[PDB]
Design a protein around this ligand. Structure first.
Ligand SMILES: CCCCCCCCCC(=O)O[C@H](COC(=O)CCCCCCC)COP(=O)(O)OCCN
Ligand SMILES: CCCCCCCCCCCCCC
Ligand SMILES: CCCCCCCCCCCC
Ligand SMILES: CCCCCCCCCCCC
Ligand SMILES: CCCCCCCCCCCC
Ligand SMILES: CCCCCCCCCC
Ligand SMILES: CCCCCCCCCC
Ligand SMILES: CCCCCCCCCC
Ligand SMILES: CCCCCCCCCC
Ligand SMILES: CCCCCCCCCC
Ligand SMILES: CCCCCCCCCC
Ligand SMILES: CCCCCCCCC
Ligand SMILES: CCCCCCCCC
Ligand SMILES: CCCCCCCCC
Ligand SMILES: CCCCCCCCC
Ligand SMILES: CCCCCCCCC
Ligand SMILES: CCCCCCCCC
Ligand SMILES: CCCCCCCCC
Ligand SMILES: CCCCCCC
Ligand SMILES: CCCCCCC
Ligand SMILES: CCCCCCC
Ligand SMILES: CCCCCCC
Ligand SMILES: CCCCCCC
Ligand SMILES: CCCCCCC
Ligand SMILES: CCCCCCC
Length: 1503
């Protein structure tokens, strides 16, 4: 019989017959499609049934009306206010606070709904539901539905439709008002070609999407732009006849783009404008204070001028924003007003600084200098504090007039946030106060106060040296100032890493203190969880407090504890003797004869779980989760009905049979069974035994099919894993009320029948099987099999039909089939419903439009949406009605929302809860467990809010389906198609909370739109928390990588300068004996010691930030290993060992993030191998010139970067596989064959030449000899040595290239060989000429090479890009020049890589250890082929020895190139050149000089 909570009562305001009457009439007079009417009717009635099982039926209808259309939660009310009667500013004013006007209209609206007869509310809701059901693929645009809904509602109330004695034909609401909008959307992509559609490839910024499609309807002036077909405006017409001619509007002259994103670096300045301000500005002031080398008023004046940078940053953000919104669109004048205000602020700030900067040089004004300095210091501080807070999108809004728009974005649709009151408010305040009060305090004593001494030295010391021939000694005269500038620049970056460093520390402290203070789970009282289980189950999983008839509080627990255990055994996890001691046995009372209840000995105080199998894990976790304070549940008779969605494109329903054996030694290992059998060798044992009892044929094949199916990874395991929701309800139904079984005790069939009837109305399952009309006949059998297995299952699939007349698109439907539908002659079952779409719905990339077409059949109140790989064990399935109570809607009181008084200040249900994420963070001896518990949290809490912000598991269906959809996927917008739903619900009113006693069981977006709305309007509480989770992580891995490069640039110069000095011996105790004992010397010892204080502070940030991803990637073991690992270091190298114990994880992780040599090289290059190569060279130059002690710390790390991927490879290292890998490498090498425009050319030039010049400066200084006491006419003219060696090899390229053209004019593979043959030797030769030029001095030769390489790539970097910007004969040469020159570079770098393994192949037994190492990491079903024919063996040995000799030859010539000039360094003694007149002393002047003119000498000049 039908819905037994609305009909089976006697106080229902209406009758089920009246509802059908209303639906029939409403369909009749608007032409809705006939079957969707039945669908929506069933949906509505099920909704009423569910809502009326925990309240009076008089209130269910009221609550539904309030929630859909009319309450403070309904979307229709929001749109009606914001558009139909303006009043958008008032909502923003009221939000920031926490006749006409807002109170009056609100009162009128509230009092106009308080007097509706209960037969009108049903009509309203029915109309809305019908409109929502019909509109295909327009559900993504909420406000459109509101517009059509209002138009239809106004039309039906007219005296024009009530007198017309004729109903419009069916399909008149889909072929007249809905289809044109769809034709507009599909016409922005998929341009029609001669017969079909193809993906129209337009630029990503001329394509209107959904977000730009509905956003027209937010503003009153956005509606007034709807031109009709003739030319008149739609609004011009009266209200009643505004619906009929809605099919004549042309939706192609009426939609614009309204966002138009731009270059990526340009957003990060307007979005996150509060992080640059609080960092740059304060950073300025610190150095401005303690830098007296440029009285007492100048100091304060400068530190005050520090405050003028904040306003400048605000102005360049406002000005940058002006290129996002359109020109005349709503909210544009506010930008000009704000620009005016900010200009005034900037003027006020930097007005008087000029007056105090120089107007006081010993005149009578000094009485008025200090006062203005101090007051403007205070003003600057006030400005900084004001701009660090008060979001950019809302300031200077009180001082504005009425105007038209006082805000730039709608404040009722993108600025409605949850106020987050309670206790967590103070906690967030405290956290973000301590972080920034610790960082600003410690980053002044370790980073600006310890840098105070070198500033005085390196800013006054003046060099004395001859110089060069083109400018003399004007550039080399001030080297130290450049070093100081580079030191400050490379230290400015670390100020940004410091914050994220402290944010990790203070979070985990606050978590431990909060999880220990509240006295929850003190350390580990482990021998108590099992001791007191029964009191946990009886009051957390059973609802007895409101069940009464209290009797026997232990017979109930017995009925449960056996069910959970037996289920484990039925899955072949426990032995038959292994369960009898793990179950409530009942023993008869020997006194009288009746039965009594015992308890397992395990359960009060012998291998309960075999070799800690997973069966232990399931029980263990279940036992701990009952300590958390779970809310008390409701009776299983009064819970809401929910549903489950699953999308499925193309998976495996079953592993078939032929794909179980296949061929053995043709792929990984052997037949699949034996692979599966070995992994679980305690189940197959129990399995075959279970077969024997059953056998005590196709069924056996089926049983093997299922047995394998439950393992591996398929679709059958998810369905059978989630269908435990069905049993968990039934079992808890009988237990709760045992008087229901006494009624018909003896009817075993009657009992089970009733139990099923309940579970089929509180739980629905639905999968969305796309493309089901075109399955292969071998795969269609699998689909039908599921229907036979679980009859209560629902499948939704698309369909087709030949076109009505020849030449048109075929109509497509979307029908569902149940498990009880009768079969037809064809074989497929007859569907229950069949709805008509308006064209192909699949338009996006991912599986997000798959969900939408099957969302119509979602009967229920809440939704749990899953992918096709989940487990959901039964023990984590019993407590479903406790997690479902997180939505605070189960224990409340109704208050008649339409009531006089009760203004919107003191209501309760204002921000409903939308998403509920689930638990995902799965988990000296006494000290070790405590410490390992602490290290657990630091790993734990790092991802507690990084991969857990919007990950959805349960969705409040009513709230989340009226405003948008469940997920969106478009070519234009790009977030992740998974996090988009999370952010959208936050900035629209909803709220997100997550439980912690459940098992989920599972940049290109900084360019997006939601980042613009979130980062410009959020308060500072939530902004900082938001910034340091998603954006501040990716933007942190870029600063560390950028800090390293800025460190190499300053290392080169610092060591170069250190290779020229006397250093004035220095003591690190208290060197205040200002005597400077070399007398005539200039000291640089403190500057050199700065390298020591940096390396320490750069691996700490590398340490803490890369420890928490260890355990979240290597939780598997370690505690057992830690004992022996500690056992090997009670007397080991300790602090230094920690250094070399902290350099391996980088090798470990990147290996897991990742075979012939060439194919691995080509994909691992361009990001890790090249930048590492250059940085390797610069470090080498430094380590030879001065050799600071703690410099090898980089040698380990930099080596590990480019030496790890070639040690974590599989068996490829023995003897000849190495050499045969050398076969194809050469063969592959032989056949490798590889203002709107003033922004792209500026972004890829500036930070590619600065790095070049910095190297170039160093080379000039190292040649200009200092302390040499020579004359003016000496010079070196070292600039030329760059030119003679930088462009000369490029000239050799073209000359041969032209001669290549000529020779053929006056074999292609051969011609490549000779071309590439000399393209390599030319560079190798020019490496030699540079060495000779510097008179055979290795130290001052390296820096020469480094400069040339940087200079070379600068030419290529700019020349190619400009040519692309801007001819064919010119361009065709360009690519050929760059290609072959780049070739020689890749050859040498590639070749040297496989040369540094010679002292690893000499060891006889090598891969044996290599095998042991890698198999520890992971097993991958290894296979070893013994395929070596007699003729293969001889040739294999034959050909391998061919290149094994060749390999050694190229090794010898490379070393020979080195030793050549090295041994010729004692043969030339006179000189190498004596030319003059511009090339004078060109090669290198000295052969014998001195650099120690100090001591006795008092005053010489040595210019
Ligand atoms: C003395 C012998 C060497 C002569 C080297 C001639 C380079 C000639 C110019 C060139 O090829 O310079 C670079 C490549 O530099 C390098 O290999 C630098 C490392 C060299 C290690 C030598 C070890 C002995 C091009 O880099 P890309 O533009 O490819 O970088 C963007 C991503 N595609
Ligand atoms: C005030 C600080 C300015 C820092 C500018 C750094 C620019 C980037 C230098 C390195 C670019 C990449 C070189 C390969
Ligand atoms: C009662 C007022 C409390 C204000 C808390 C502000 C916290 C700001 C943190 C960041 C400062 C730069
Ligand atoms: C007269 C002395 C001028 C010194 C200028 C130093 C500029 C350093 C810039 C560093 C940029 C990374
Ligand atoms: C006072 C003499 C100044 C000579 C020019 C200095 C240019 C420095 C440029 C630094 C770029 C990193
Ligand atoms: C003021 C800082 C501007 C942001 C710099 C971002 C550099 C990386 C862009 C990819
Ligand atoms: C804007 C700078 C104001 C300076 C005031 C000076 C007054 C001088 C009075 C003698
Ligand atoms: C919060 C970090 C503080 C570090 C110490 C600063 C004061 C040192 C005084 C000796
Ligand atoms: C967290 C703020 C700590 C402030 C310490 C001030 C310096 C220590 C005393 C010299
Ligand atoms: C001249 C000092 C050389 C020190 C060793 C350089 C190479 C280190 C490789 C680990
Ligand atoms: C001039 C001092 C050189 C010290 C070299 C130390 C070598 C350590 C190799 C690991
Ligand atoms: C010794 C004080 C220097 C200036 C500190 C400014 C702090 C601003 C928050
Ligand atoms: C560093 C100043 C950048 C200014 C960009 C202006 C862009 C206007 C469209
Ligand atoms: C001698 C009186 C000086 C007053 C200066 C006032 C400055 C206000 C910004
Ligand atoms: C010579 C020191 C004068 C300090 C004046 C301070 C005024 C603060 C309002
Ligand atoms: C931001 C206030 C604390 C840091 C500056 C004052 C103390 C310096 C030692
Ligand atoms: C970036 C934080 C540096 C902390 C250095 C502490 C040194 C202790 C010996
Ligand atoms: C302060 C502006 C810096 C712009 C750098 C652009 C880099 C693009 C890759
Ligand atoms: C560190 C800022 C010094 C500014 C001096 C201006 C003359
Ligand atoms: C722009 C800061 C320096 C001003 C100098 C005025 C004499
Ligand atoms: C000398 C005191 C140092 C304290 C360091 C705390 C991190
Ligand atoms: C006299 C100007 C010299 C500029 C040198 C730039 C590298
Ligand atoms: C010469 C005064 C210091 C200059 C620093 C530039 C960053
Ligand atoms: C300080 C910003 C530097 C950006 C460098 C981009 C390569
Ligand atoms: C006449 C100045 C020449 C400068 C050359 C810089 C590469």
């Amino acid at each position: 019989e039908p819905y037994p909570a609305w009909t089976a009562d006697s106080q229902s305001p209406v009758s089920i017959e009246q509802i059908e009457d209303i639906f029939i009439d409403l369909t009749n007079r608007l032409g809705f499609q006939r079957d969707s009417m039945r669908n929506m009717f069933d949906h509505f009635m099920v909704l009423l049934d569910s809502r009326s099982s925990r309240m009076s039926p008089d209130q269910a209808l009221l609550s539904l009306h309030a929630d859909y259309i009319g309450g403070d939660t309904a979307n229709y009310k929001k749109w009606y206010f914001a558009a139909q009667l303006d009043m958008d500013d008032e909502i923003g004013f009221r939000n920031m606070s926490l006749d006409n006007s807002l109170e009056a209209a609100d009162f009128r609206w509230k009092a106009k709904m308080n007097q509706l007869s209960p037969l009108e509310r049903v009509r309203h809701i029915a109309l809305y539901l019908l409109c929502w059901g019909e509109a295909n693929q327009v559900r993504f645009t909420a406000e459109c539905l509101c517009f059509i809904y209002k138009c239809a509602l106004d039309y039906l109330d007219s005296p024009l439709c009530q007198q017309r004695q004729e109903p419009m034909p069916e399909g008149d609401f889909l072929n007249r008002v809905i289809t044109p909008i769809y034709h507009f959307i599909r016409n922005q992509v998929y341009e029609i070609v001669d017969g079909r559609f193809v993906k129209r490839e337009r630029d990503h910024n001329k394509i209107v999407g959904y977000d730009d499609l509905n956003q027209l309807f937010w503003y009153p002036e956005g509606i007034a732009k709807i031109v009709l077909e003739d030319g008149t405006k739609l609004i011009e017409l009266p209200l009643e006849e505004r619906y009929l001619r809605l099919g004549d509007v042309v939706w192609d002259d009426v939609f614009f783009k309204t966002y138009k994103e731009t270059r990526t670096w340009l957003h990060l300045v307007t979005n996150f404008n509060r992080i640059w301000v609080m960092h740059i500005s304060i950073f300025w002031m610190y150095f401005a204070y303690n830098s007296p080398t440029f009285l007492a008023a100048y100091k304060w004046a400068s530190c005050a001028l520090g405050g003028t940078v904040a306003s400048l940053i605000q102005i360049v953000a406002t000005l940058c924003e002006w290129s996002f919104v359109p020109r005349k669109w709503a909210g544009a004048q506010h930008l000009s007003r704000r620009f005016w205000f900010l200009c005034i602020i900037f003027g006020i700030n930097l007005g008087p600084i000029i007056f105090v900067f120089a107007y006081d040089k010993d005149t009578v004004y000094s009485t008025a200098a200090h006062v203005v300095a101090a007051v403007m210091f205070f003003v600057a501080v006030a400005t900084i504090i004001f701009f660090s807070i008060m979001p950019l999108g809302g300031l200077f809004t009180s001082y504005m007039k009425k105007s038209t728009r006082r805000y730039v974005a709608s404040q009722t649709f993108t600025a409605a946030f949850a106020p987050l009151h309670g206790l967590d408010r103070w906690m967030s305040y405290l956290v973000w106060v301590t972080v920034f009060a610790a960082k600003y305090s410690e980053s002044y004593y370790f980073l600006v106060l310890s840098l105070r001494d070198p500033i005085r030295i390196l800013s006054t010391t003046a060099m004395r040296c001859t110089g060069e021939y083109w400018w003399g000694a004007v550039l080399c005269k001030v080297q130290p100032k450049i070093v100081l500038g580079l030191v400050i620049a490379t230290d400015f970056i670390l100020f940004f890493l410091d914050t994220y460093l402290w944010y990790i520390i203070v979070n985990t402290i606050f978590s431990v203190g909060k999880s220990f203070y509240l006295g929850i789970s003190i350390l580990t009282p482990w021998r108590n969880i099992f001791t007191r289980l029964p009191k946990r189950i009886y009051s957390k999983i059973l609802a007895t407090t409101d069940m009464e008839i209290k009797y026997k509080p232990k017979v109930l627990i017995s009925q449960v504890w056996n069910a959970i255990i037996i289920s484990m055994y039925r899955e072949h996890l426990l032995a038959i003797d292994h369960v009898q001691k793990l179950l409530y046995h009942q023993v008869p009372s020997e006194i009288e004869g009746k039965r009594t209840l015992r308890a397992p000995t395990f359960f009060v105080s012998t291998e309960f779980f075999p070799r800690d199998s997973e069966a232990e894990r399931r029980i263990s976790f279940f036992a701990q989760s009952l300590s958390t304070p779970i809310p008390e549940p409701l009776p299983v008779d009064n819970m809401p009905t929910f549903t489950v969605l699953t999308p499925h494109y193309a998976e495996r329903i079953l592993l078939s049979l032929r794909e179980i054996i296949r061929e053995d030694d043709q792929f990984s290992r052997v037949t699949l069974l034996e692979y599966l059998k070995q992994l679980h060798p305690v189940e197959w044992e129990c399995f075959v035994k279970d077969t024997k009892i059953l056998a005590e044929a196709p069924e056996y094949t089926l049983r093997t099919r299922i047995w394998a199916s439950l393992r591996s990874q398929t679709l059958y395991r998810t369905i059978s894993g989630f269908m435990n929701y069905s049993r968990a309800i039934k079992l808890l139904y009988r237990v709760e009320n045992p008087e229901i079984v006494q009624m018909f005790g003896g009817n075993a069939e009657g009992l089970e029948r009733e139990l099923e009837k309940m579970a089929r109305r509180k739980f629905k399952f639905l999968v969305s099987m796309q493309r089901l009309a075109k399955f292969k006949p071998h795969e269609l059998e699998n689909a039908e099999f599921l229907l036979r297995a679980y009859p209560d299952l629902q499948i939704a699939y698309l369909d087709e039909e030949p076109p009505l007349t020849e030449g048109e698109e075929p109509r497509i439907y979307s029908a569902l089939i149940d498990g009880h539908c009768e079969i037809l002659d064809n074989g497929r079952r007859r569907p229950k419903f069949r709805v008509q779409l308006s064209g192909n719905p699949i338009l996006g990339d991912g599986k997000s439009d798959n969900q939408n077409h099957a969302l119509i059949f979602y009967r229920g109140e809440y939704i749990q949406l899953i992918d096709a790989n989940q487990d959901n064990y039964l023990e984590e399935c019993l407590k479903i009605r406790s997690v479902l109570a997180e939505f605070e809607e189960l224990n409340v009181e109704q208050v008649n929302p339409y009531a006089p008084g009760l203004r919107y200040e003191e209501q309760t249900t204002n921000h409903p809860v939308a998403i509920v994420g689930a638990r995902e963070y799965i988990f000296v001896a006494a000290g070790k467990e405590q410490t390992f518990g602490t290290l657990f949290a630091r790993t734990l809490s790092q991802i507690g809010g990084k991969l857990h912000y919007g990950h959805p598991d349960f969705i409040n269906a009513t709230f989340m389906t009226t405003r948008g959809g469940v997920s969106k996927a478009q070519k234009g917008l790009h977030l992740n198609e998974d996090i988009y739903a999370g952010m959208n619900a936050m900035l629209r009113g909803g709220r997100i909370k997550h439980c912690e006693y459940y098992q989920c069981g599972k940049g290109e977006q900084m360019l997006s739109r939601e980042y613009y709305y979130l980062g410009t309007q959020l308060p500072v509480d939530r902004f900082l928390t938001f910034y340091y989770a998603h954006p501040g992580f990716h933007l942190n891995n870029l600063f560390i990588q950028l800090s390293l490069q800025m460190f190499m640039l300053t290392l080169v110069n610092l060591s170069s300068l250190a290779h020229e000095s006397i250093m004035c011996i220095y003591d690190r105790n208290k060197p205040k004996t200002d005597v400077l004992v070399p007398i005539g010397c200039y000291n640089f010892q403190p500057a050199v010691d700065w390298v020591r204080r940096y390396t320490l502070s750069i691996f700490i940030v590398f340490w803490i930030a890369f420890v928490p991803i260890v355990v979240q990637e290597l939780i598997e073991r370690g505690l057992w290993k830690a004992t022996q690992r500690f056992f090997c270091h009670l007397l080991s190298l300790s602090p230094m060992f920690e250094v070399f114990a902290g350099q391996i994880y980088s090798s470990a992780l990147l290996s897991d993030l990742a075979i012939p040599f060439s194919i691995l090289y080509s994909r691992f290059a361009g990001s890790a191998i090249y930048m590492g190569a250059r940085s390797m060279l610069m470090l080498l130059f430094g380590t030879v010139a001065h050799w600071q002690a703690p410099l090898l710390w980089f040698w380990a790390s930099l080596s590990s970067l480019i030496f790890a991927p070639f040690v974590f490879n599989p068996h490829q290292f023995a003897w000849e596989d190495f050499f045969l890998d050398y076969r194809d490498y050469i063969r592959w090498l032989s056949r490798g064959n590889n203002a709107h425009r003033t922004n792209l050319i500026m972004a890829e030039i500036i930070p590619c030449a600065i790095y070049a010049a910095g190297c170039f400066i160093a080379f000039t200084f190292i040649n200009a000899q200092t302390g040499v006491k020579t004359t003016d006419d000496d010079r070196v003219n070292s600039v030329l040595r760059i030119i003679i060696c930088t462009l000369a090899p490029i000239a050799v390229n073209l000359g041969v290239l032209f001669f290549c053209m000529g020779m053929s004019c006056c074999t292609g593979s051969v011609m490549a060989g000779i071309a590439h043959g000399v393209a390599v030797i030319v560079h190798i030769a020019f490496f030699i000429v540079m060495w000779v030029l510097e008179s055979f001095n290795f130290v001052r030769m390296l820096i020469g090479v480094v400069t040339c390489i940087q200079c070379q790539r600068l030419i290529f970097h700019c020349m190619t890009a400009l040519m692309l910007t801007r001819t064919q004969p010119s361009r065709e040469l360009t690519a050929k020049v760059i290609e072959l020159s780049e070739f020689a570079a890749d050859f040498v770098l590639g070749h040297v890589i496989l040369i540094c393994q010679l002292p690893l192949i000499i060891i006889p037994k090598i891969d044996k250890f290599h095998s042991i190492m890698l198999f520890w990491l992971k097993p991958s079903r290894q296979i070893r082929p013994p395929i070596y024919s007699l003729k293969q063996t001889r040739l294999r040995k034959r050909m391998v020895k061919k290149y094994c000799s060749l390999y050694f030859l190229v090794l010898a010539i490379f070393a020979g190139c080195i030793i050549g000039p090295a041994v010729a360094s004692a043969k030339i003694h006179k000189h190498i050149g004596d030319s003059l007149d511009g090339v004078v002393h060109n090669l290198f002047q000295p052969i014998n000089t001195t650099n120690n003119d100090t001591g006795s000498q008092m005053s010489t000049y040595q210019s």
